[PDB]
Amino acid sequence: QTGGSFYEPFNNYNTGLWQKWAFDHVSMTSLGEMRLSLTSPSYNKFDGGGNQSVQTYGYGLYEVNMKPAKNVGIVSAFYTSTGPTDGTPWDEIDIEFLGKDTTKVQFNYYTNGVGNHEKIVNLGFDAANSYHTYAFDWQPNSIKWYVDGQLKHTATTQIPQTPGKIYMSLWALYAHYNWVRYTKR
Ligand SMILES: [Ca+2]
């Protein structure tokens, strides 16, 4: 990987740490939030709103304090990915919110282009109403997804290994991202 540990409060838009797909996607608020906006076409990428990291990141703790958009059809996401990206394996780890029901969160991952690891977890709260912290601890032999510090799911087989960029996307209305943190453990 090219990137070490960082904390992103989203007070300013750091172009050294992030890049916008389109200047339009993708606006900062006065309350220290990054905002994604979808207007209006499917199916991304890259026909939806999206932000991505400049550097690539590997094993460690990824935390995102966000609020998905609440509307049928749309998907708000936080994920690492190699892209793809031809000449590189498709490795990706996902936190996704289906707008039709923001009381659920979907976990997933891809390794060498093979996903189909969708795990839908009931949150016990509407994710759109307040900020909650969603995380995954990515290590070579396990991914552990957390919601507000509590373990919600564990994957132990076919774990991705290729460092990827950190993405935020809204596709298929606003998704808000309060802060992000990567800890190279
Ligand atoms: Ca913030």
Swiss-Prot record:
Return the similarity comment.
Answer: Belongs to the glycosyl hydrolase 16 family.
Organism, by scientific name, is Bacillus licheniformis
Question: By its UniProt entry, which CDD domains does this protein fall under?
Answer: GH16_lichenase (cd02175)
Q: What else is known?
A: Beta-glucanases of Bacillus have a substrate range similar to lichenase of germinating barley.
Q: Which reaction does it catalyse?
A: Hydrolysis of (1->4)-beta-D-glucosidic linkages in beta-D-glucans containing (1->3)- and (1->4)-bonds
User: GH16 domain: from which residue to which, for each copy?
Assistant: 1-185
Q: What is the effect of changing residue 126 to N?
A: 60% of wild-type activity
Question: According to the entry, what is the taxonomic lineage of the organism?
Answer: Bacteria, Bacillati, Bacillota, Bacilli, Bacillales
Q: Which residues form the active site?
A: 92 (nucleophile), 96 (proton donor)
Q: Which Pfam families match?
A: Glyco_hydro_16 (PF00722)
GO aspect biological process, one term = carbohydrate metabolic process
Q: Where are the annotated coiled coils located? A: none
Molecular function (GO) terms for this protein are:
licheninase activity
Q: Which UniProt keywords apply?
A: Disulfide bond, Glycosidase, Hydrolase, Signal
| Superkingdom of the organism of origin | Bacteria
Query: Might you give the EC number(s) for this enzyme?
Result: 3.2.1.73
- Record annotation: effect of changing residue 137 to N: 80% of wild-type activity
This protein is called Beta-glucanase
The regions listed as transmembrane in this protein's record are: none
